Amino acid sequence: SMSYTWTGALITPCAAEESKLPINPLSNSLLRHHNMVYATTSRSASLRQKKVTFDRLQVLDDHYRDVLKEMKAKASTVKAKLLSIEEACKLTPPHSAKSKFGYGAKDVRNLSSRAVNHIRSVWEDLLEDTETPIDTTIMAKSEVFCVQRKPARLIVFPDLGVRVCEKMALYDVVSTLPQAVMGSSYGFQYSPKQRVEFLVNTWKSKKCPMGFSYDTRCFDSTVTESDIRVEESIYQCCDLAPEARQAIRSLTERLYIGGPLTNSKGQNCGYRRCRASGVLTTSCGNTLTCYLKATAACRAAKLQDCTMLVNGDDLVVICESAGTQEDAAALRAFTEAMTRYSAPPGDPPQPEYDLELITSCSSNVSVAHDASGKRVYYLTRDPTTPLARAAWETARHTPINSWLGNIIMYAPTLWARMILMTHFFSILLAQEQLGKALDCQIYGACYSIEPLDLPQIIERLHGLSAFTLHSYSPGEINRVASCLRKLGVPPLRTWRHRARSVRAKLLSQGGRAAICGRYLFNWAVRTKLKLTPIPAASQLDLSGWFVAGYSGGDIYHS
Numbered sequence: 042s043m044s045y046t047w048t049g050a051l052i053t054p055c056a057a058e059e060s061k062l063p064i065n066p067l068s069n070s071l072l073r074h075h076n077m078v079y080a081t082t083s084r085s086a087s088l089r090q091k092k093v094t095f096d097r098l099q100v101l102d103d104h105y106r107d108v109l110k111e112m113k114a115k116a117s118t119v120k121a122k123l124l125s126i127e128e129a130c131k132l133t134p135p136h137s138a139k140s141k142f143g144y145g146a147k148d149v150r151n152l153s154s155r156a157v158n159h160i161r162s163v164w165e166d167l168l169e170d171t172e173t174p175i176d177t178t179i180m181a182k183s184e185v186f187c188v189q190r191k192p193a194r195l196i197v198f199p200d201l202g203v204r205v206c207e208k209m210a211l212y213d214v215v216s217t218l219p220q221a222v223m224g225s226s227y228g229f230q231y232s233p234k235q236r237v238e239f240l241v242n243t244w245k246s247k248k249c250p251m252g253f254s255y256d257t258r259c260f261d262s263t264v265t266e267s268d269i270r271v272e273e274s275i276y277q278c279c280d281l282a283p284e285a286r287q288a289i290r291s292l293t294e295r296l297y298i299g300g301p302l303t304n305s306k307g308q309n310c311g312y313r314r315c316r317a318s319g320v321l322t323t324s325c326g327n328t329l330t331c332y333l334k335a336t337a338a339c340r341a342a343k344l345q346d347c348t349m350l351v352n353g354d355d356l357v358v359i360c361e362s363a364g365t366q367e368d369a370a371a372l373r374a375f376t377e378a379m380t381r382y383s384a385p386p387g388d389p390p391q392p393e394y395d396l397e398l399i400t401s402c403s404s405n406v407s408v409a410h411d412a413s414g415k416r417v418y419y420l421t422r423d424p425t426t427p428l429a430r431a432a433w434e435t436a437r438h439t440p441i442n443s444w445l446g447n448i449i450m451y452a453p454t455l456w457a458r459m460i461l462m463t464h465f466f467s468i469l470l471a472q473e474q475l476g477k478a479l480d481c482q483i484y485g486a487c488y489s490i491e492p493l494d495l496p497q498i499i500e501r502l503h504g505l506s507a508f509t510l511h512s513y514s515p516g517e518i519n520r521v522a523s524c525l526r527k528l529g530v531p532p533l534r535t536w537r538h539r540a541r542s543v544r545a546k547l548l549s550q551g552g553r554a555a556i557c558g559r560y561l562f563n564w565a566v567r568t569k570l571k572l573t574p575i576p577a578a579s580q581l582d583l584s585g586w587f588v589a590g591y592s593g594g595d596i597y598h599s
């Protein structure tokens with residue numbers, strides 16, 4: 042069946058669409074080549090539609106069924122709970138898209154009559170109606186990139202009331218199930234530090250390691266009605282409340298397998314027969330599905346001792362090498378099996394024999410040394426996208442601050458410390474907004490974070506070594522340097538100068554600002570101050586942080 046079918050109507054915006062980076066004084070300080078930074082618009086929707094629209098031919102086999110049974114036996118041990126309206130309401134972002142039924146995210150959050158009554162009425166319709174397709178809105182996403190142009194991403198999502206009903210029935214499932222089914226292979230149970238720990242141990246545990254990253258072209262579109270039903274069958278293995286069991290059953294047929302696409306004008310856009318990106322089960326469902334297809338493809342291909350790390354469609358395999366000629370063949374056999382399971386490659390996979398050469402979750406493993414000269418492993422990535430997005434956030438007030446998430450997640454990196462910390466700490470201080478909370482996403486979930494809380498947050502996630510790292514690899518230094526030239530970002534010596542300036546100002550303020558100068562900017566000065574465990578880091582409530590993925594699940598923690 043076709044992934045999509047269209048009516049001819051256009052994917053429309055609900056407002057004016059900015060695509061060009063503004064010539065702004067503050068963003069210009071970070072990036073000069075403004076014409077190389079763009080945001081995607083609905084003007085590219087058609088190129089994405091051509092790329093995502095195709096017919097799927099799936100052929101499941103003995104290896105696929107064996108693994109599915111192994112996965113169900115593990116799912117059998119889970120006892121999932123049904124969240125109340127109030128608990129489900131509390132997990133709604135304050136700026137989540139309002140309902141088409143005269144209420145919004147703030148009404149949901151405050152548990153207002155119009156909101157609570159409508160959610161209850163949607164819940165009963167899921168218990169009573171097991172057939173009628175649920176309506177979704179199709180929108181082109183607005184994301185920022187650097188040139189060399191990408192076409193817009195298509196986002197599919199149901200109404201507010203429905204989204205609160207998915208939380209009541211599925212939130213605890215998507216939170217505890219993947220870890221019970223997959224174990225150490227579920228990448229969302231880890232922080233960045235724990236992620237390096239697992240990749241290094243897995244690599245070092247093999248006698249002769251071989252690794253590869255497998256890229257699926259338009260994974261959401263490769264997902265069939267069969268894959269979605271097989272997914273519900275893993276969910277049914279949970280101990281469930283009668284109403285939750287019915288809601289999962291109804292949501293699977295009416296929403297998860299396919300449904301009507303409606304544009305912002307209210308016109309009919311077409312029909313979806315694959316994965317909606319704006320649902321609660323997108324993260325969990327894609328992880329399980331990618332893990333099932335890959336695990337069975339390893340057996341079919343005769344690849345030895347497979348250890349895998351899955352985060353939705355992002356998959357990395359670390360196995361036992363059988364030699365060059367053997368490895369090449371087995372990797373093609375793996376691809377052959379994935380194509381049959383309806384997961385063909387975007388860019389063909391390559392056998393790697395050095396961990397640092399593999400890219401998984403846009404990241405790669407790299408080495409730097411601590412204050413005591415000992416080797417420290419950390420996750421990095423190419424800084425182009427994070428820098429182009431930080432420039433946009435400087436000129437325009439965005440709902441989610443990617444720059445803040447990049448600081449937290451990539452805190453030990455050369456680029457987050459020197460550029461991202463310096464740029465924002467200068468601007469915020471000059472505006473008296475260092476203690477003003479900001480929204481960011483960690484693993485799809487929304488968090489309200491004060492920039493001044495960063496030293497404690499980094500010490501917990503990355504240890505004190507995040508504030509002492511030096512002697513970065515030549516490769517890492519070359520990548521940072523060539524990117525700065527490309528985007529027209531000032532050299533590292535200008536950043537070192539700018540850092541010295543903020544550090545002083547932060548130190549004279551005292552309180553939490555002095556903690557920021559001492560820890561975050563100790564790299565910028567030769568007379569290094571004494572760095573000890575911050576009292577506040579000991580009692581940080583970092584639960585809920587690295588548990589599960591919630592991309593498109595409309596989730597708000599804190």
Ligand SMILES: O=C(O)c1c(-c2ccccc2F)c2cc(Cl)ccc2n1Cc1ccccc1
Pocket residue numbers: 233236352353355402403404420421443446447450451482483484485
């Ligand atoms: O965007 C994520 O969800 C995310 C981040 C991340 C990066 C910056 C800010 C906030 C974040 F959450 C991340 C960072 C590292 Cl070092 C490793 C994996 C990571 N993921 C999972 C992931 C799964 C699939 C594809 C990409 C990333």
